[PDB]
Amino acid sequence: PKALIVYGSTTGNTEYTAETIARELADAGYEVDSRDAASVEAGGLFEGFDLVLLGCSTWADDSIELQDDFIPLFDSLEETGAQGRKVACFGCGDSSYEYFCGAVDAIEEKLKNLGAEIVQDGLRIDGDPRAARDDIVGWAHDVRGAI
Ligand SMILES: Cc1cc2nc3c(=O)[nH]c(=O)nc-3n(C[C@H](O)[C@H](O)[C@H](O)COP(=O)(O)O)c2cc1C
């Protein structure tokens, strides 16, 4: 199977998380394509992928709390080929904020509205992802089991 991982990360936490998930999928036999949201074009982005994992950090704001590099993708999610696609979301945040990992909820909800198939509840990491390595690997393990 081929998996696409797209992440938006400012300080590197969601990027570390994406790389950890990418390793788990690869060690399980998937061919994985891991890309920074700052470098992708939304049009047909998901074409040909069996599984798509989208990740992003949350930044408190009055209008949109998604990480800046992910915004353009999020705004054009309807052109990616999400209908009937198996997808799962993940993201880093901090539970001292009201909207803890709120970007994960936002992305899941829009993918659901576009007809995607959410394979597993989103991975929400509090603090340093390096300290949650077991949680990432385990979630990655469960998403492969749902595909
Ligand atoms: C100014 C600021 C605002 C933040 N706002 C939120 C927030 O609204 N919700 C949340 O869960 N985390 C919030 N965080 C925590 C970041 O999402 C967290 O530091 C995260 O690990 C960053 O991930 P990244 O390195 O992949 O961009 C905020 C952090 C800062 C510095």
Side-chain angles (χ1 to χ4, degrees):
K2 302 171 61 196
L4 174 64
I5 301 173
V6 182
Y7 59 88
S9 187
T10 296
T11 79
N13 290 336
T14 308
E15 173 182 54
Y16 167 85
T17 304
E19 292 174 345
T20 299
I21 292 166
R23 262 231 164 258
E24 295 290 303
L25 294 191
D27 295 353
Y30 279 59
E31 19 165 331
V32 186
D33 191 338
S34 181
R35 310 203 213 162
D36 185 324
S39 79
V40 307
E41 276 287 69
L45 183 60
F46 308 165
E47 286 288 317
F49 286 104
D50 303 299
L51 179 58
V52 179
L53 299 186
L54 294 183
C56 173
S57 46
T58 305
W59 299 88
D61 199 89
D62 286 318
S63 312
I64 207 243
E65 65 294 333
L66 272 51
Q67 191 275 167
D68 284 342
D69 300 319
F70 205 91
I71 290 168
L73 177 58
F74 180 81
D75 280 354
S76 287
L77 219 47
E78 73 284 351
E79 290 183 24
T80 61
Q83 97 181 311
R85 187 83 50 191
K86 274 160 193 297
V87 303
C89 306
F90 58 98
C92 293
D94 178 335
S95 59
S96 80
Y97 290 87
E98 176 169 23
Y99 301 121
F100 170 56
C101 283
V104 179
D105 294 320
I107 299 164
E108 277 189 354
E109 208 226 36
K110 182 165 185 174
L111 245 12
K112 289 171 211 148
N113 290 338
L114 297 183
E117 195 196 332
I118 309 295
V119 142
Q120 190 60 48
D121 274 355
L123 175 58
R124 297 172 179 71
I125 293 163
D126 192 8
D128 187 0
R130 291 162 191 81
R133 196 166 194 287
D134 286 336
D135 299 350
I136 301 163
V137 163
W139 181 89
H141 188 262
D142 295 327
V143 331
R144 295 194 271 104
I147 270 63

